[PDB]
Each structure stands twice: as structure tokens, then as C-alpha cells.
Amino acid sequence: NQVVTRDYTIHMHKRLYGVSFKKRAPRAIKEIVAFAQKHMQTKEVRVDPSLNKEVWKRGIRNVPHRLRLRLSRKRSDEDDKALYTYVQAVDVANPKMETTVVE
Amino acid sequence: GAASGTKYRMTLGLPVQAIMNCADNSGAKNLYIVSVFGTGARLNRLPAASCGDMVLATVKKGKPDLRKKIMPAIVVRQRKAWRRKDGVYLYFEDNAGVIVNPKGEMKGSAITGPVAKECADLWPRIASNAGTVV
Amino acid sequence: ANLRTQKRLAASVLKCGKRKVWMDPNEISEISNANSRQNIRKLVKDGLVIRKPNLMHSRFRIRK
Amino acid sequence: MKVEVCSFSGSKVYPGAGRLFVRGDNKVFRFVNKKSESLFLQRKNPRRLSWTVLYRRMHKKGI
Amino acid sequence: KFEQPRHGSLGFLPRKRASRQRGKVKAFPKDDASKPVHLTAFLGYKAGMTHIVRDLDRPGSKMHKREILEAVTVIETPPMVVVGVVGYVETPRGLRSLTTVWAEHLSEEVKRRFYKNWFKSKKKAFTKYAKKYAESTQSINRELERIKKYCSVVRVLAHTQIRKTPLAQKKAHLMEIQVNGGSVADKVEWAREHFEKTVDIKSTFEQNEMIDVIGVTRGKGNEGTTARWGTKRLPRKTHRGLRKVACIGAWHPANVQWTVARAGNAGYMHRTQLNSKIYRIGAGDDAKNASTDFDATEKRITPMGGFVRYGVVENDFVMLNGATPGPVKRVLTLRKSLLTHTSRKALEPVSLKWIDTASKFGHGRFQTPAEAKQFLGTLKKDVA
RNA sequence: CAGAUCUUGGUGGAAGUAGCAAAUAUUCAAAUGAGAACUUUGAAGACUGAAGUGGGGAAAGGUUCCAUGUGAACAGCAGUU
RNA sequence: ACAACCAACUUAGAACU
RNA sequence: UGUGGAACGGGGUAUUGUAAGCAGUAGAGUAGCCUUGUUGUUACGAUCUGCUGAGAUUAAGCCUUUGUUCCCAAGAUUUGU
Secondary structure, eight states: OOSEEEEEEEEHHHHSTTOOGGGHHHHHHHHHHHHHHHHHOOSOEEEOHHHHHHHTTTOSSOOOSEEEEEEEEEOOSSOTTOOEEEEEEOOOSOOOOOOEEEO | OOSSSOOOOOOOOEETTOEEEEOSSSSBOOEEEEEETTOOOOTTOOOEEOTTOOEEEEESSBOGGGBSSOEEEEEEEOSSOEEOTTSOEEEESSOEEEEBOTTOOBSSSOOOSOBOHHHHHHOHHHHHHOOOBO | OOOHHHHHHHHHHHTSOGGGEEEOGGGHHHHHTOOSHHHHHHHHHHTSEEEOOOOOOOOHHHHO | OOOEEOSSSOOEEOTTSSEEEEOTTSOEEEESSHHHHHHHHTTOOTTTSTTSHHHHHHTTOOO | OOOOOOSSOTTSOSOOOOSOSSOOOSSOOOOOTTSOOOBSEEEEEEEEEEEEEEEOOOTTSTTTTSEEEEEEEEEEOOOEEEEEEEEEEEETTEEEEEEEEEOSOOOHHHHGGGOSSTTTSOOOSSSHHHHHHHHTOSHHHHHHHHHHHSOSEEEEEEEOOGGGTTOSOOOOOEEEEEBOSSOHHHHHHHHHHTTTEEEOGGGTOOTTOEEEEEEEOOOOOEEOHHHHTOOOOOOTTOTTOSSSOSOOOOSSSOSOOTTSOOOEEOSOOEEEEEEEEEEEEEOTTOTTTTOBTTBOOOOOSSOTTOBTTTBOOOSOEEEEESOOSSOTTOEEEEEEOSSOOOSHHHHOOOOEEEEOOSOTTTTOOOSSHHHHHHHHOOOHHHHO
16 A cells, blocks of 8 residues: 555645745745655655646746645556656545545 | 922923024024033033923024023923823923023013923923913 | 757757757657757758747837 | 624624725725725725625625 | 943843743742631733723822723733642751652653653653552651641642643643741641642732732843843944944953843743732633623623734733733743732722724734624625 | 984874855756766756946957866865856 | 828817816 | 654644635627617626635644654664772
């Protein structure tokens, strides 16, 4: 059951509160990576380019307060005993929702 | 100044060199605060006054016989807000004062505009010559 | 690989700037073997190298 | 022990809330907060803003 | 020339961080043997501040029989559990502890004070002592009798019930509280009877009592001389900065004097504030905690939305006029006054008329949710 | 020769210290590679905003131009460039 | 003396908001 | 392994001020067609009105939660009267 996929909502506002404007988008990427690392227990996190586009959609200093992310812990083309997390973006109307196990 | 007793400490909004309106009918309009009675010794601190104090002022605009001289005056209104013992912060629309003598008796006869309760209670002559009190 | 020479040749062939030169990321090996203007033209004909369209500068608000 | 009413926002004012402004025409105004006081200084009408009780009463909000 | 007073007091030195956070009693009240056996200190947690409107009872004052608004500090004081007794001999080198007697069973709260990694540990703190208490019942009596005959000074060990507070910390605060009754034998007997028992705040302090609050002030880190000592700002023309002191010293003595203001730590210091008056000892079991005789609303001592960064006070609390050192949720030490209060201000009974329960999270204007509902009528989230 | 603020050369404490902060700003994925924050490709976000960080020349330089390889020294961090 | 459109930028004024 | 923690969600508390969308001839007026009009048919029109004390934010050093989903019973170093 190591291979799994879950949809989370990350509250980016409280993580980007006191951050400088020129570093908000890069730090949002970093906090997303740490967010995926903590929840999936995998040290290797790959961010989808479309998710990076979504994070950078409104510039470097205007990141959405909440982001609907899809975290997929899965196998890699490297050794078959290493787990890594792949993070995507989910298109929803209201991102205010609970975490769901997707199948 | 041995008028009616003691006054509670209030925020000082009228330091030296402040220009305030003259609320009496003595013919003055531009009371220029020169010094404040009861000011202690403290380095670099400008002597400031609030409502009910006994500042020393000169007349910059008004009747010529009232200018080029120092006369006692009492501050009746101030723009700076001050709180009372009941926890109410209050302030007026302008800084105003009335020309008096060292004994506290007003040189004028009538007071234009509202007056502070602290000043009215401190000086009976001002209370007698004033209308609306706060 | 290193496609700096190929991008410069593609810009010269397409008569556009290097900012408007698009190269297929899935054909890096094929693009890297061009090394010539004739091969760049072959890549353009095959669609592996294209000229990106100009950025939008609409004048609807100005006209209104 | 009396609760007053703000001159601008018309809300209940408990002791130690807001400020008191005495105008030159002997009129006393009670402001419940700096927002109401600043808006009064900016000469905003309390009947125009939708969040004031005066507006709601004049526009029959609540019935 | 132009003489001016000193900037700061050379009595609160060094201006360093305090070596403690709980706050300790540096001097207990002088013991009077005629008085009944009682404690001289208590521990609480600062919950926040609020308003108080009361009628002044000061003859000769302009505000006599008038309304006055004063700021008060709320300290939540749940009952403290007594778990030990300490006896102090009176050697010519000072007070010296002779022996300590502990209760049969110590709760998890007080036992966590003895550990830095409680969960990782085996929790074998009072194991052999508990075995000795259970199966001997002779050495405990021997030590108590030793404290009876020797140990002119007797202090009990009491720990706070921090689990009843809305605080994330589970480690209770343990403190030695002196007993200032008489008959050192009776003091030991009182401690033995109160072993594993809870002493309440109303049994230690009473209404209108003047006490002292002991605690560590808010931490502020390093600070320049301008804000650390109140020195004058240098002119705008000053090269290489102005928030400093111009002349740090003269020539011979060719050293920087200890009396000169220097940059450094400016917070987190141990302070004892004298003459704090108890305005209300409220109990946590009644719904009229914040009500008065002139305001009969059924409300407790908590602003709507909760105390800022503290929570909801559900235990006994003490309301003190003015401010106390330390930030919110910090543990504070309440100590009985060492002085005698004969002034009219100290002896004046205090009758609260209204207690503010509006939200401290903003410009709150409602005292109760019922009042908020009455004013706002029905909302969109209420109609459907 | 112990001196001459001696001559030439080598080497210390300061010291892993001062510092490597002007010119708005980088991010994600892939390829290569032993090694990728600096290489290349794609995508996004930006700047120069035509008196430009664009395209050319005069003076001056002299091969710095181009391709293919390398990463010993230089590019005050790194390097597959 | 009338006059069917195309192709132009200004200036001044009024009401409303 | 626990009156456990975390990520969300809910409620409360606060800030601002009535979101988008729809509808209304309310709207200074303007322009075409005919049964020719004391709610004219057609279209545009800053703005205004009703859904709407709405919408948005709400810890990042606010409170609370019985809700949903995960995580922990690990690893390394030192220590003897």
C-alpha cells in the first residue's frame, strides 16, 4: 500500500505571511516540497511543471492562499525499493475542502 | 494656583511657542504661549500645558495695547485628546485660552465656545463666564 | 547536449530572433546532429524546429 | 453605569470605548472606534454606508 | 554642565537574561506564631487583561462616589497540590535544608518536572520512595519528627495543576511555599495532612488583599542604549549612527565604567512588583464569574472569542488592578505582602460594577453572544 | 652582525577573520554528465522598453571570429561551460 | 440656390452620476 | 499507544465594507418600426436598486472542535558512587 495518491489542501497564506515579495513564489515552492516531504515521508519530491505554472500564475509575490494539491507516492525507474512523491495541481472551484484518498 | 484645589494629570498638547485662539472678548486672537506655571526642572523638555493650566502668553494678533507684553492666561480647550478617571478620551476642535490675572480673574466678560470641565472646576471665574461645559 | 549553435542557425534560417526559436525537447539527439544550415532547413521542414508567434499586443482598448 | 450610542455608527458604546469630540458649536459627538471617527472627519454621511444602523433603519432592513 | 538625572537605575543589574522562568520568592513574610497556619504564596498563569468600572470610595477626592475605569490583569489560579515538605535549620551560615519528605504518590504532572524526555524515559522517578512509604511507614514519621524538633522554618512543596489550564505544556510547576503559622510541630502536621491534597486560591488570599506579583518580564533580545536605558537620540548629522551614547567614558580612569549605558539584553528579567490589589477572587464553578451586583448578566470571565493566545479560563482566577510582569500564559508567583497597609487607598474595599467581556481580538462591541445576536438580528448563515 | 623606517628572498600572529550586499528575479521538468544553483532544451515569471541590456560603425585591440575536444591554471563560489 | 454620403480633429456649454 | 501530534475542514472571534452573476425600464438621455402608447414594443447607456451585514481574509505569536486523513511505539553520541 506504499503506492498511494491523496488530494490535500495546503494553506499557503500562513506559510507565506511575513515573506519578502521577491521570494514569495520560490518559498512557496520550497514549502510545498516540505509539505509533501512531511506528509508522504519521502525525501524525494518532484513538482509538476503545471503545478509550478499554477504557483507562478499571479507573479512572484501573489501566491494563492490555498492550493489544491495531488500527492502521489509511487515507484521510480531507479531501484525498486525507493519511494518518491509526485505533486500535481487539482482544478477545483473552492479549494476549502478536506483531504481525500483518491483511487 | 490656590484657586479651587488639585487637578488630575492630563495629556499636554500645548507646548511653548504654540499659538491658540483667544476665547474671551478682550480683543486678542493669537495667544502665543511663552511659559507654563508649575513647570519643574528637566533637561531639553519643553514646558507644555493642558486645559486648566496657567500658561504665560503674549498677544500676536488683536488690540495693539494687548501686544508686546506678557500676561497670564488659562487654557480652556485643546486639540490633543486626554482621558478622564472614567476612561473617556475627549478632545476639542481647537486650542483656546482666556486672558486672566495672577489671581485667576478673567480680563474679559464672556467666553466663546465650549469649555473644559477641569478648567471650569479649577477656576470659578471661568466657570461663571462660560456657557456649555463639555 | 549543447544546442547553442543549432539555435543560432535556426534563428538565421527562420529570419527571426533566438527568442522565437522553438526546438522539440523530445528530439534533442536529432537536433544535435544538424551542425549545418541544410540540416537546420531539414529540421524546419520536418517540424522539429519552428518559429514561435509574436507576443500579443492587441489594440482593442486603444481603439475603443 | 450607562451604555451610550455612537454618533456616526450608531452602535452601543461601553465605557472605555472610542473617543469623544466636542465641536466648536457646543455639540458633543461620540465615536465608537477610529474608523467611525476618521469617516466623520472625512465628512462621510452615516446614512450612506451600508453597515450603519441609520442606513438600515432608513432602508427598512430587518422589518 | 546642565545637570540631569541618571538614565536607568543601578539596582536592576546586570541587565542579563534571568536564570529562571517560574520566578522565585526572595523573601517570605516574617513568621507570626500567633496567627493560624497558612501559606504565604501561590502560583498562577496570566490569562490576559480587561476593563473594570467601579465606584470610588475615597473621601476627600474629586472622584469620590464617582465612576472610574481601571485596567485589571486576570491570573488563572487552579488549586495547587501539596506533595512534599521541606524543613530549614537556622545555621550561622544561613537557612539550610535538613531533609525533605514527599507524598506517597506523585502525579504525572509533577513527575514530568524531573525529566527532560518524559516519554522516552521509563518514568521511574518516585519508585523506591513510594515502596518505602507503602511498606515502612516509619522513616517518613522519623523524618517528619526531625523537621518537628529542628527546622525552625517549614516550607511545603506544591505543584500547579497545569492540565486544567488550556496550555500545551504538560510539565507542572513545582515550588516551595512557606507556611507562616506557628508551632513548627503544627506546621509539619498541617503539611502531612495536606499531602496529596489541593489548596485553593481563596484559602490563601482574600478580597481587597495587597500582594506582590513575581515573574520574569517579556523577552526583547538585544537593544541599543536609546531603548535599553532611555538615552537621548543623537542628532541626524551624526556619522556612523545616532542610536548610541556619545561619550562612553573620559580619560583616567582609563576604563569603561560600569555605570555607563551599553547595548545588550533588554528583556526577560526577574521582577517583583509590590502592592497589587486583589479586585476579585472568582471561582470556576459558577456561571456568574464576571457578573456584578449592578450588572446581572450571566457571563463568565472570558472575552468572546477567548483570551488572545491563552484560551478560556475554566478554573478559579484572581483579578489584579494594573499590570503584572511577563507575557500571556506565563506562570506568575503571588506572594503575601511584607509591609503593613494602613493607607486609605490600600484599605478601601473594592466593589466592581461592570466587567468587560468584549473581544480583545479587535474593536469588540458586544459583551455576550446573546447581545450580539440581539443587535444583529438574523444573518444569512442564520436564516438558512 | 641584532639592529642602520638596512638589501634580497622566504615565512608568521592578525585569520578561516574583514569580506565576496549598487544595477527589481528567479522557478519547475527533462537531457548530458562521476559530479548540475550556474551547461543545453522546454515551460512559467520578469527586465532592458527604440537617447535600449537592440542592429551597425570611427579610434583602439589582433584572432578574441567558427567548428571539434579538455576541464591542469584563470573565470576572487562552481562548472559538464 | 437647394444636398444623397464619405472622410477629421478641436473649442465651448448642459444634464446626470 | 497517549485525556497524543500534525495537515485540512467546521464553528466562534475579528478586519473590510455589500462580492461575481441575474433581474428591475430606476437612470440624465440617445438612435430605428408600426397595431400610435396614463408599465409601447427595439437597442445602448456613468450610475442606482433586490438577492446581500453580502463576498473575501481570519494565525502566520486568536479561541474551540466530538468532524476527515495521516504519523509516532525510531535512529546516532556520551555517561559509574
